Amino acid sequence: QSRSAKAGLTFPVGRVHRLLRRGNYAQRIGSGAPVYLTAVLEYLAAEILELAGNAARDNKKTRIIPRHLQLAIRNDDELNKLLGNVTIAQGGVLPNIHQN
Amino acid sequence: RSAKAGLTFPVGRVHRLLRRGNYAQRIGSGAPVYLTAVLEYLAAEILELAGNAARDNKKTRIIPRHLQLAIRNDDELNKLLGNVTIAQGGVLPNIHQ
Amino acid sequence: RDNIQGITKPAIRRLARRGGVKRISGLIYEEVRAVLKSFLESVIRDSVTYTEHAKRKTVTSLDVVYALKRQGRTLYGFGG
Amino acid sequence: RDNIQGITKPAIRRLARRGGVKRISGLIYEEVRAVLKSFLESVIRDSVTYTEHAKRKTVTSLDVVYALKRQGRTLYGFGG
């Protein structure tokens, strides 16, 4: 049985454990660490994807464009706080009008 | 090797030391010598700039305030050492009118 | 009387003197207490994490320097 | 007519519109040309270094992203 089915996940732990050996991070890789990391990567990918789906749903659009990701990542904090220095390609700026 | 290149900094210590970091698969030959030369030059530069202030404040023992005068002057070095902090360093003397 | 008011207004005025100012408000002391407290939470959370991970029940200076390295700030003189 | 004046005042005004301003000076365009040129030297020096080290005589986008990583800035979408 494959390790991802043996754990109940979708991102390939077989790729993850293979990259860490070729990543020269330390001498040995403890078994259990790559599936633990794969769980967090599988969590965050769907976490941002749900906010991107909600952004496409309020504009009645059946195709995710990078503006949706930009708006989602800038709207709520603790993700914008995490990605505090990134700029998405063709993303644009939040709608903001100040008291002039 | 330090005598074999005229350096005051230990080449073999560095060559052992970067091997103890898993920085790559293999370590080349002249690279620890290259590091030793760079570190020696940088130490010489900062000791020049420190000893200037050390003489100019009529002092013999270099105290870290005389060091922060040296760090905060060379614009290439102060640009390189922008985000640093030094205990008992002091401040740059600069005010407005 | 908690210790956030242990930071005296003369001490803030004194650091303001080293800061480079002569006129300040009285609202300044409470504002700067809030800012400084936010800074200390955002650093000692990382320091306590580094202390807890190594299963050591006391914090030393290398933990402090390692924590400050995350902020984008480096402190020499104590090892790091 | 060099290319630093190729950055037109309507383009700066247009980005200023996306910036969030309505009144600007005429000194702004020359000042922002100087700032932008300083930014481009400080990035393409690193990019040309990355291109020169790998003994490749052309610059690609991974070189750009790797150079921008030094600035403390990350760009997705092109690989990195």
Add this chain to the structure above:
Amino acid sequence: TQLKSKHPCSVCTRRKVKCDRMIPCGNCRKRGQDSECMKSTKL
């Protein structure tokens, strides 16, 4: 459980992957191989 040896069985002296400290050991209780561990230290 009888946490009393905490010591490897003879199968573990051949194949030291871990020791379960079971009857006769759970290291010995995978491949259906009681016979080596009743021919062992055997409490």
Add this chain to the structure above:
Amino acid sequence: GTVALREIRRFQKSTELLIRKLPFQRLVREIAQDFKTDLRFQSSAIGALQESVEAYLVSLFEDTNLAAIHAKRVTIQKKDIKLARRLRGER
């Protein structure tokens, strides 16, 4: 001031490359030519610069805008840009 606020949000929606690409390309080729090699580029690397360029420029625009609004005026002078860059680190 007939048009100042109905258009400031018009291009906040139209996310595109705003700096026109050809003089940008010639500028970057010239300042690359100021370095030693006669060094060509991937075509994608021009846009890979251009989005980062516009991101930096928009960031400094917004920062000096908020500085000038604190300065109790609605106009930006280069005095505020020098402030905004000087407080932000680099110079």
Add this chain to the structure above:
Amino acid sequence: GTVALREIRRFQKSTELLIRKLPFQRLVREIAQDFKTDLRFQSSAIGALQESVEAYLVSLFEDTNLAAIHAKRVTIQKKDIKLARRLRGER
């Protein structure tokens, strides 16, 4: 304003720890106590905090000073501190 400029340079020479160390120590022990462990410290780690603390505080002081000088006044209000921290990243 009898004393404003002959003393502003007096403590620019006397590099010491300016924040008095005991209430600083009690404050840091209390906010460590707000985290779970009853966790003691190395004595040197208190000063290791304190120099970084004073460095950050002096940096923000100087930054909001230069902001307020741009604001065409000589007094600092918390409006300028909020500006200086907001333009600098964190909030």
Add this chain to the structure above:
Amino acid sequence: RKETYSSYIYKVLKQTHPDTGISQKSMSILNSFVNDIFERIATEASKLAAYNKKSTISAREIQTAVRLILPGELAKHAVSEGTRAVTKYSSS
């Protein structure tokens, strides 16, 4: 060849919004983002591993690194998801 995450990502997106479509450039965006977070966490874990004189990278170190790279309750809701899958994997 290209080491994309596209099949994995496209099968993830059907879990919540099974009708929404995706862009190839957008696919590149979050693929690069995933590689970024992976490099960040692995590099952080390596530094603390070489700090405590350890030669291996267990999930304890990853638990520390995810708790420091991810902020606040995003970390606290990634720790639980992280520690769930390892125990499901172990009891299999």
Add this chain to the structure above:
Amino acid sequence: RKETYSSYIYKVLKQTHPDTGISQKSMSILNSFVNDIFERIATEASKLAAYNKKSTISAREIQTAVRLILPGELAKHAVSEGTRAVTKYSSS
């Protein structure tokens, strides 16, 4: 034990200012600074080495890394000092 650079540093300082004295805390300051620059350059060299699919770290890669970590003419006066000692070492 303590892996100081103190003997090396103290013998360097006699080259230019043979009368000036040093502080132990100041010794710690520039020793930590030296370790900082060493870690910065070595980490940068490692990243570009793993970028170009190379397994070894020659002095070519160090020449690139010193040219990017050090700014401007400080780099240009460190490259020449760097490339001098290797040729003196080779012809020995």
Add this chain to the structure above:
DNA sequence: TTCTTACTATTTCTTTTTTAACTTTCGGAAATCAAATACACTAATATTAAAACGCGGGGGACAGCGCGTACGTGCGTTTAAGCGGTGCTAGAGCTGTCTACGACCAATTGAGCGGCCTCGGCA
């Protein structure tokens, strides 16, 4: 004059080819248990520098008011972007192989380190 008829993609059945998974070996890492050892922290005073903390007072902040320079602002053009090919030759990939080069495994140390001391040079 559409009843047919073998093309004809086509589209789905079935298999090969591209990796990941299940066992042994075991070495060197890692956890454990116990002892030695360091040490961080309470607690007595003893100042004593230092924070409040007043009642002046002045100087800066701040608001209102002219004003006029100096910004937007259509209007009418000119000028290039830019799109659309051509196109041809430059570097990028991309294998074939191999001389050299570091990893490493032992000997062989001396040199860069604790630890006193003897001496008095810097604040």
Add this chain to the structure above:
DNA sequence: TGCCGAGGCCGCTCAATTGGTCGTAGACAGCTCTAGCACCGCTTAAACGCACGTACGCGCTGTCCCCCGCGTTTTAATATTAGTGTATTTGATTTCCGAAAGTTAAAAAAGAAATAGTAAGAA
């Protein structure tokens, strides 16, 4: 000026070095070919000067508010000593995953097996 420092002292133990293997690089050599850049040559949308006024930055004056004076208490301070009871670090010991061996499969392409159109030839 003195008192506590700061180099300058010796013993020494462990890393630096020296010398061979040898496994496997990356380094040239010779491709195939994009592909990028040069160029013409169209549009047509956008930059650019022009009068055009209102604002709004700015300077001036008045106000009045609040922030810093320095005497004067008043309260918490470093700074000592000692205990001292915890945590901490070694250190054998012991247990034990980690790698590495690969040989069941498997991934999705590949070819074929209908197969549902599919162009032509007479009522």
